[PDB]
Amino acid sequence: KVFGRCELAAAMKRHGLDNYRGYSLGNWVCAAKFESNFNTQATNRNTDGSTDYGILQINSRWWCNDGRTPGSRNLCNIPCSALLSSDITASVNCAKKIVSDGNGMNAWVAWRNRCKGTDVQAWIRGCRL
Numbered sequence: 001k002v003f004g005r006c007e008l009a010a011a012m013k014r015h016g017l018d019n020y021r022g023y024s025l026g027n028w029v030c031a032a033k034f035e036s037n038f039n040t041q042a043t044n045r046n047t048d049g050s051t052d053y054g055i056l057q058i059n060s061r062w063w064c065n066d067g068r069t070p071g072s073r074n075l076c077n078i079p080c081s082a083l084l085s086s087d088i089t090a091s092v093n094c095a096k097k098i099v100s101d102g103n104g105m106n107a108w109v110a111w112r113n114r115c116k117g118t119d120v121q122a123w124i125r126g127c128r129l
Contacts, residue, residue: 026120
């Protein structure tokens with residue numbers, strides 16, 4: 001499913017990401033935009049051979065098992081395909097584990113380079129959450 005800005009924001013707030021660990025909701029929407037383009041089916045392979053899955057582009061070497069990433073830690077204990085679902089619950093739950101591991105949202109290269117230190121508020125402006 002390809003979400004709309006406000007639609008994804010509402011779904012994320014309902015899932016308790018709103019200001020989760022200090023990151024206001026705008027950070028999460030901004031990240032989803034540049035990571036997957038609001039598309040739940042997005043997949044992108046990395047040079048090291050791992051692949052990023054879903055709306056939040058969760059990585060296969062650490063968080064999920066995709067059956068083809070040698071040494072996958074699978075910390076979220078879930079098959080990577082579970083993250084391509086129209087229901088963002090598993091992505092959101094796994095994301096809360098990543099964001100809590102000490103590095104914050106810096107784990108997401110796109111947040112780091114395109115959202116960090118920007119008016120993230122603009123991403124949920126006009127939304128009825």
